[PDB]
Amino acid sequence: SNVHFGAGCDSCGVYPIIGDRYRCKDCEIGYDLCKDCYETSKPGRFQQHTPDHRLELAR
Numbered sequence: 106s107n108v109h110f111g112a113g114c115d116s117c118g119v120y121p122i123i124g125d126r127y128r129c130k131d132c133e134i135g136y137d138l139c140k141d142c143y144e145t146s147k148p149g150r151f152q153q154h155t156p157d158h159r160l161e162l163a164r
């Protein structure tokens with residue numbers, strides 16, 4: 106299993122993210138989503154992270 110030690114999902118709060126992790130390119134603090142949240146975010150927006158922000162798979 107792919108376990109992203111150190112990273113939690115800023116939509117649902119799962120920590121660590123297991124499986125795919127999407128990491129915000131624009132976000133300083135940092136902003137991460139799990140696969141389930143990324144394939145539906147949320148209140149998932151606030152702060153520094155706007156819907157204008159793009160995320161990419163963490164590799």
Ligand SMILES: [Zn+2]
Pocket residue numbers: 114115116117118119138139140141142143
């Ligand atoms: Zn999530």
Ligand SMILES: [Zn+2]
Pocket residue numbers: 129130131132136153154155158159
């Ligand atoms: Zn962001």
